[PDB]
Design an enzyme around this catalytic site. Structure first.
Site, mmCIF file in Angstrom:
data_model
loop_
_atom_site.group_PDB
_atom_site.id
_atom_site.type_symbol
_atom_site.label_atom_id
_atom_site.label_comp_id
_atom_site.label_asym_id
_atom_site.label_seq_id
_atom_site.Cartn_x
_atom_site.Cartn_y
_atom_site.Cartn_z
ATOM 1 N N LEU A 29 8.706 -12.692 3.819
ATOM 2 C CA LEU A 29 7.628 -12.684 3.045
ATOM 3 C C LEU A 29 7.971 -11.496 1.793
ATOM 4 O O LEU A 29 7.873 -11.369 0.885
ATOM 5 C CB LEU A 29 6.234 -12.258 3.539
ATOM 6 C CG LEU A 29 5.761 -13.561 4.321
ATOM 7 C CD1 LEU A 29 4.113 -12.991 4.876
ATOM 8 C CD2 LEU A 29 5.523 -14.725 3.321
ATOM 9 N N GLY A 30 8.780 -10.357 2.538
ATOM 10 C CA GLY A 30 9.039 -9.303 1.572
ATOM 11 C C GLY A 30 9.976 -8.218 2.333
ATOM 12 O O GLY A 30 9.904 -8.258 3.597
ATOM 13 N N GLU A 31 10.221 -7.358 1.454
ATOM 14 C CA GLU A 31 11.043 -6.368 2.358
ATOM 15 C C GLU A 31 11.147 -5.005 1.537
ATOM 16 O O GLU A 31 10.692 -4.888 0.272
ATOM 17 C CB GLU A 31 12.566 -6.676 2.477
ATOM 18 C CG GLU A 31 13.463 -6.650 1.348
ATOM 19 C CD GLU A 31 14.907 -6.806 1.533
ATOM 20 O OE1 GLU A 31 15.969 -7.221 0.480
ATOM 21 O OE2 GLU A 31 15.439 -6.589 2.518
ATOM 22 N N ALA A 33 12.222 -0.233 1.854
ATOM 23 C CA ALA A 33 12.956 0.702 2.481
ATOM 24 C C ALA A 33 12.753 0.895 4.035
ATOM 25 O O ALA A 33 13.799 1.123 4.714
ATOM 26 C CB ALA A 33 12.887 2.131 1.555
ATOM 27 N N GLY A 35 11.506 -1.422 5.983
ATOM 28 C CA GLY A 35 11.690 -2.611 6.960
ATOM 29 C C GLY A 35 11.638 -3.877 6.138
ATOM 30 O O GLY A 35 11.579 -3.832 4.842
ATOM 31 N N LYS A 36 10.880 -5.112 6.997
ATOM 32 C CA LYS A 36 10.542 -6.343 6.420
ATOM 33 C C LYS A 36 9.313 -6.762 6.919
ATOM 34 O O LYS A 36 8.693 -6.192 7.907
ATOM 35 C CB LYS A 36 11.695 -7.339 7.010
ATOM 36 C CG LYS A 36 13.088 -7.052 6.248
ATOM 37 C CD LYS A 36 14.059 -8.065 6.689
ATOM 38 C CE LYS A 36 15.369 -7.679 5.905
ATOM 39 N NZ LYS A 36 15.356 -8.564 4.822
ATOM 40 N N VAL A 37 8.975 -7.642 6.193
ATOM 41 C CA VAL A 37 7.525 -8.296 6.515
ATOM 42 C C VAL A 37 7.709 -10.176 6.649
ATOM 43 O O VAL A 37 8.649 -10.456 5.524
ATOM 44 C CB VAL A 37 6.350 -8.096 5.308
ATOM 45 C CG1 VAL A 37 5.361 -8.846 5.712
ATOM 46 C CG2 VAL A 37 6.104 -6.813 5.382
ATOM 47 N N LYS A 57 4.945 -7.189 10.223
ATOM 48 C CA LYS A 57 5.604 -6.070 9.408
ATOM 49 C C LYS A 57 6.676 -5.405 10.626
ATOM 50 O O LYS A 57 6.116 -5.184 11.825
ATOM 51 C CB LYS A 57 4.421 -4.796 9.327
ATOM 52 C CG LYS A 57 5.198 -3.769 8.422
ATOM 53 C CD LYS A 57 4.083 -2.637 8.596
ATOM 54 C CE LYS A 57 4.868 -1.388 7.472
ATOM 55 N NZ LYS A 57 3.883 -0.241 7.657
ATOM 56 N N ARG A 156 -2.834 -5.095 -5.971
ATOM 57 C CA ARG A 156 -1.453 -5.377 -5.240
ATOM 58 C C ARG A 156 -1.644 -5.009 -3.931
ATOM 59 O O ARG A 156 -1.222 -5.640 -2.754
ATOM 60 C CB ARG A 156 -0.094 -4.624 -5.788
ATOM 61 C CG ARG A 156 -0.363 -3.126 -5.590
ATOM 62 C CD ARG A 156 0.909 -2.115 -6.223
ATOM 63 N NE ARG A 156 0.251 -0.849 -6.181
ATOM 64 C CZ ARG A 156 -0.285 -0.367 -7.276
ATOM 65 N NH1 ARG A 156 -0.776 -1.151 -8.292
ATOM 66 N NH2 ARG A 156 -0.795 1.020 -7.230
ATOM 67 N N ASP A 170 -2.720 -4.194 3.333
ATOM 68 C CA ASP A 170 -1.344 -4.252 2.765
ATOM 69 C C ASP A 170 -0.478 -4.080 3.939
ATOM 70 O O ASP A 170 -0.827 -3.559 4.936
ATOM 71 C CB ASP A 170 -1.130 -3.252 1.671
ATOM 72 C CG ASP A 170 -1.075 -1.860 2.252
ATOM 73 O OD1 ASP A 170 -0.131 -1.315 2.375
ATOM 74 O OD2 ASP A 170 -2.086 -1.041 1.869
HETATM 75 C C1 LIG Z 1 6.424 5.878 1.801
HETATM 76 C C2 LIG Z 1 4.977 5.515 2.525
HETATM 77 C C3 LIG Z 1 5.234 5.883 3.807
HETATM 78 O O1 LIG Z 1 4.006 6.225 1.702
HETATM 79 C C4 LIG Z 1 4.760 4.032 2.317
HETATM 80 N N1 LIG Z 1 3.765 3.555 2.936
HETATM 81 C C5 LIG Z 1 2.652 3.150 2.300
HETATM 82 O O2 LIG Z 1 2.377 3.418 0.985
HETATM 83 C C6 LIG Z 1 1.695 2.466 3.098
HETATM 84 C C7 LIG Z 1 0.207 2.109 2.869
HETATM 85 C C8 LIG Z 1 -0.206 1.426 3.733
HETATM 86 N N2 LIG Z 1 -1.563 0.877 3.784
HETATM 87 C C9 LIG Z 1 -2.501 1.905 4.250
HETATM 88 O O3 LIG Z 1 -2.440 3.060 4.419
HETATM 89 C C10 LIG Z 1 -3.674 1.034 4.472
HETATM 90 C C11 LIG Z 1 -3.676 -0.060 5.098
HETATM 91 C C12 LIG Z 1 -4.827 -0.760 5.334
HETATM 92 C C13 LIG Z 1 -4.951 -2.425 6.120
HETATM 93 C C14 LIG Z 1 -6.010 -2.194 7.185
HETATM 94 C C15 LIG Z 1 -5.923 -3.606 8.068
HETATM 95 C C16 LIG Z 1 -4.697 -4.410 7.842
HETATM 96 C C17 LIG Z 1 -3.967 -3.980 6.734
HETATM 97 N N3 LIG Z 1 -3.902 -2.871 6.026
HETATM 98 C C18 LIG Z 1 -6.124 -0.464 4.902
HETATM 99 CL CL1 LIG Z 1 -7.609 -1.103 4.676
HETATM 100 C C19 LIG Z 1 -6.276 0.697 3.854
HETATM 101 C C20 LIG Z 1 -5.033 1.483 3.890
HETATM 102 CL CL2 LIG Z 1 -5.094 2.870 2.804
HETATM 103 N N4 LIG Z 1 0.783 1.373 4.809
HETATM 104 C C21 LIG Z 1 0.803 0.908 5.781
HETATM 105 C C22 LIG Z 1 0.238 -0.487 6.000
HETATM 106 C C23 LIG Z 1 0.423 -1.262 7.282
HETATM 107 C C24 LIG Z 1 0.636 -0.542 8.433
HETATM 108 C C25 LIG Z 1 1.022 0.860 8.252
HETATM 109 C C26 LIG Z 1 1.113 1.481 7.289
HETATM 110 N N5 LIG Z 1 1.892 2.024 4.231
#
Ligand SMILES: CC(C)(O)CNC(=O)c1cc(NC(=O)c2cc(-c3ccccn3)c(Cl)cc2Cl)n(-c2ccccc2)n1
Ligand SMILES: O=c1[nH]cnc2scc(-c3ccc(F)cc3)c12
Length: 296
Positions: A29-31, A33, A35-37, A57, A156, A170
């Site tokens: 679905l996407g990729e 730095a 990893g991949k989705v 993920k 997004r 996300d």
């Molecule tokens: C350079 C980096 C590290 O900075 C890039 N990584 C990122 O920018 C970033 C932002 C997010 N997503 C979140 O933190 C985030 C995720 C959710 C949510 C809740 C339920 C299901 C799905 N997603 C909700 Cl409701 C609110 C937030 Cl705020 N990353 C993330 C997403 C999923 C899993 C782990 C990390 N990685």
């Protein structure tokens, strides 16, 4: 690391483990730095579903620090449970790559959905736009109730499933897939979505989230256009810090633009609470104003 998940962990679950062989990878679905989705089929997850679609993920890194950060994120994702928060189903930590399993949202991210159901590429009507805005606000009410600061609220970072269901969530690849929406300073910041105090002091609060929600309303009512699209990143910073406001979109009734303007008060303390914003949008979604975009 500056995700809202890590930010909440730093300021503050029995994680479900899924067997690797229960996951059948179907497509990428996407990729990024990191990893991949993948799109995948997952067995033995939901009771009446043998080959249910999930989004997976996959983390490229498997070091002790990334493994401990992964565990803490998975404990927090397990705790987030709301009708307008993307469902998290569990992990697979049977060696490299570490996997996080989420529900698959068939219409993809809300930005992509708005652009594909917009005028210049049928178009979503006023009542559907209000229903999208109300669902995003419901998810933000839930997060504010846990003192959870999103830090990157934008279309997004919302997903759309069948029946126009919109959820916040996300798979952590927006900084790679939508790199144009971020600007480096020191660290990739979504400057076009940030209030003046966040660009200046790099401080994120429930108030900077409400400002970004106002920018989400503007994305919704422009069918996914980039805020300040006429300007470069540095020119956008100047506009925001000088106190300039985004113009009212043509599909936006004055009643919704008043809500947007309440989110964009320069002083964080003068912005509306997300609960007030949600109650106003919920009322408009159940009784849409008689507004014809053609008549301005
Ligand atoms: C350079 C980096 C590290 O900075 C890039 N990584 C990122 O920018 C970033 C932002 C997010 N997503 C979140 O933190 C985030 C995720 C959710 C949510 C809740 C339920 C299901 C799905 N997603 C909700 Cl409701 C609110 C937030 Cl705020 N990353 C993330 C997403 C999923 C899993 C782990 C990390 N990685
Ligand atoms: O995702 C893709 N994009 C373009 N061509 C192909 S061929 C095969 C795939 C694929 C199948 C399963 C996966 F887990 C990952 C990728 C694929």
């Amino acid at each position: 690391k500056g995700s809202g998940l890590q930010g909440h962990i730093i300021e503050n679950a029995c994680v479900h483990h899924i067997k690797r062989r229960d996951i059948v990878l179907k497509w990428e679905l996407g990729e990024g730095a990191f990893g991949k989705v993948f799109l995948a089929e997952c067995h033995n997850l939901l009771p009446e579903q043998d080959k249910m679609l999930v989004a997976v993920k996959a983390l490229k890194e498997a070091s002790e620090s990334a493994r401990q950060d992964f565990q803490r994120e998975a404990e927090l994702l397990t705790m987030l449970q709301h009708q307008h928060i993307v469902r998290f189903f569990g992990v697979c930590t049977e060696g490299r790559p570490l996997l996080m399993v989420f529900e698959y949202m068939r219409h993809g991210d809300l930005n992509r959905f708005l652009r594909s159901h917009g005028p210049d590429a049928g178009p979503l009507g006023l009542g559907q736009l209000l229903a999208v805005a109300s669902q995003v606000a419901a998810g933000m009410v839930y997060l504010a109730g846990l003192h959870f600061v999103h830090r990157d609220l934008a279309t997004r970072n919302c997903l759309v499933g069948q029946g126009l269901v919109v959820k916040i969530g996300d798979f952590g690849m927006s900084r790679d897939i939508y790199s144009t929406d971020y600007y480096r300073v020191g660290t990739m910041l979504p400057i076009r979505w940030m209030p003046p105090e966040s660009i200046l002091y790099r401080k994120f609060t429930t108030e900077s989230d409400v400002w970004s929600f106002g920018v989400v309303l503007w994305e919704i009512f422009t069918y996914g256009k980039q805020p300040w699209y006429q300007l470069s990143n540095t020119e956008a910073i100047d506009c925001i810090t000088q106190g300039r406001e985004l113009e009212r979109p043509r599909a936006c009734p004055p009643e919704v633009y008043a809500i947007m303007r309440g989110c964009w008060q320069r002083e964080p303390q003068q912005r509306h609470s997300i609960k007030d914003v949600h109650a106003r949008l919920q009322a408009l979604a159940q009784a849409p104003p008689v507004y014809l975009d053609v008549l301005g």
